Amino acid sequence: SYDVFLSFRGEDTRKTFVGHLFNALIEKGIHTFMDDKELKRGKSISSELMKAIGESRFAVVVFSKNYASSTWCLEELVKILEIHEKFELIVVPVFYDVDPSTVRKQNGEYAVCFTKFEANLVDDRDKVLRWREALTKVANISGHDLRNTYNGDESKCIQQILKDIF
Amino acid sequence: SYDVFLSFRGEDTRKTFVGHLFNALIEKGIHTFMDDKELKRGKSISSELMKAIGESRFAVVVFSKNYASSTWCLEELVKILEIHEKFELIVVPVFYDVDPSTVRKQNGEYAVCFTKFEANLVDDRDKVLRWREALTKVANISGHDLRNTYNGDESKCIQQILKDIF
Amino acid sequence: SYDVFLSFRGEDTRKTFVGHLFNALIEKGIHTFMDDKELKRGKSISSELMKAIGESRFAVVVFSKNYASSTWCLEELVKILEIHEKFELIVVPVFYDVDPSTVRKQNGEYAVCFTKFEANLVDDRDKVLRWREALTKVANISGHDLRNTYNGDESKCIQQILKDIF
Amino acid sequence: SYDVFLSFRGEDTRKTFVGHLFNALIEKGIHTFMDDKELKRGKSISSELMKAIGESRFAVVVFSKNYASSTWCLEELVKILEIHEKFELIVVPVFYDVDPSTVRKQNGEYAVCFTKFEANLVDDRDKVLRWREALTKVANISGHDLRNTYNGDESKCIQQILKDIF
DSSP states (O other): OOOEEEEOOTTSTTTTHHHHHHHHHHHHTOOOOOOOOTTOOOSSOOHHHHHHHHTOSEEEEEEOSSTTTSHHHHHHHHHHHHHHHHSOOEEEEEEOSSOHHHHHTTOSHHHHHHHHTTSHHHHTTOHHHHHHHHHHHHTTBOOEEIIIIISSOSHHHHHHHHHHHO | OOSEEEEOOTTTTTTTHHHHHHHHHHHHTOOOOOTTTSOOSSSBSHHHHHHHHHHOSEEEEEEOTTGGGOHHHHHHHHHHHHHHHHSOOEEEEEESSSOHHHHHTTOTHHHHHHHHTTTTTTTTSSHHHHHHHHHHHHHHSOOEEOTTTTOSOHHHHHHHHHHHHO | OOOEEEEOOTTSTTTTHHHHHHHHHHHHTOOOOOOOOTTOOOSSOOHHHHHHHHTOSEEEEEEOSSTTTSHHHHHHHHHHHHHHHHSOOEEEEEEOSSOHHHHHTTOSHHHHHHHHTTSHHHHTTOHHHHHHHHHHHHTTBOOEEIIIIISSOSHHHHHHHHHHHO | OOSEEEEOOTTTTTTTHHHHHHHHHHHHTOOOOOTTTSOOSSSBSHHHHHHHHHHOSEEEEEEOTTGGGOHHHHHHHHHHHHHHHHSOOEEEEEESSSOHHHHHTTOTHHHHHHHHTTTTTTTTSSHHHHHHHHHHHHHHSOOEEOTTTTOSOHHHHHHHHHHHHO
């Protein structure tokens, strides 16, 4: 069924950028499963999300301001990275509206959220440290950085992604 | 005697929206002459633009918040309006993040930009008056809008326009 | 003999950029005549410069901080533009390390020089006004803007120039 | 078992110098693996870089003023030095706007950058000491310089290096 399941929080890019990527991939003929509900229930992953992650040939993750600001987003990133470790999922980082250098050091607005996420909720979980290590490891794999590689394009990055996919 | 044309403001559309619209139009099979690729080095700019506008059929101008700022864009709008007055060139409006009522009264950001040019070219050239009248008429002219019609997906609006051309 | 004679003041770009252009054009096989002497005698043009300008199939002008700061540079630009008007010289503006918008309005550091050039020397010549009008007319012809079209490349612009030439 | 390699600092060489050198090397017929095109999306970055360095023959690193700033670049220099210590990889220095004496003593801008990292990784990791020693040895190693050898044309230096490779 679904070939590559792009994963990004439906907060900012859900209107223009991620919408454009979904439309282009769907039109081009490659089957893909996306964010099922804008009102998605549960910060965890149900059967549908787990099955999509397991049965995805590859995955796409777009890092933005909110891309980790939700605990659901961090958990999904953790599951995806563990899939890449244990399964054959291809992970292609996409850096849109975010500085790759700051994300590498786990610094920026995400650092402010992590400090806010450094309360007793994660002190009873330590999942913030796991998420930060996972993000750092994921940043070790090169991807596409629209704000840097082209710095002024949006359709060119989509063309590159389509060239990689098909 | 060409197929279509495009018009946008480079400050806010040359990066994300206008490029996606151009890609959609090119893929759909209708030739488009944007002011980014339809320009040979040797030939002039104003002359080439006037010729391209004269030989094109359908024009779609996306009026942005700072649309009045670009004097060249205002002149292009005036020329397009004059061509539509003399000949019968296809007219189509595009308006994102700028409600038609705001532009029709030349108010808001348009009002501020005109006030900056209130003593510049309204009376010294009488072309600012013609541009204001043409903008008012084009605003009165019905087109495609997205502030409230779609309001949820820019790519949905692009596909709607592409399907609605013919 | 010489096919296209690139014209730029040997002040800043004579080390890296214009040197790269001269080396690439010479290597590619297109015959070209360049700035003969770094200690060029006379702010006017001798027989060699006039003959090169007349017998050039095309010309290349790179606009930078000093590209008009010398009276010799302005005179050469005037002669080149008059050649383009009366002869078949192809003029391709090149915008390197300069904002095209400011140059269009004849504003910027060049404006400071023009105000400094607005003394009795030009008051007895009025050649500053002629040079400003000539620059404005030349800016009406589109060319290549490395800081904008690519914004991060130097070899790509050279490749585009070579594609245009041969 | 490859032909050559390239090394540069993205802050000051990725735009003008390193690109011209890469174009010259590619045109000359010797394959080059820069850290801008020799990278597949799926595979890692550190692993791919280590493999490429191991399989390449000739490495040319242009030490810039802020060369010490890039920790990844320093690690790459350390790995290249270690490979040259164990194997016999071709070593070639490149130094522009940074006199060899300044880098040899790790002084000037190198001194300031190391002082910023004086309490960071000199004693906490003992790899800053190894990097300083390797930089000192490489500075003692003769290479190609342009501050006083050529001092008049960067492209002349690039052509000199390309001719001097073999």
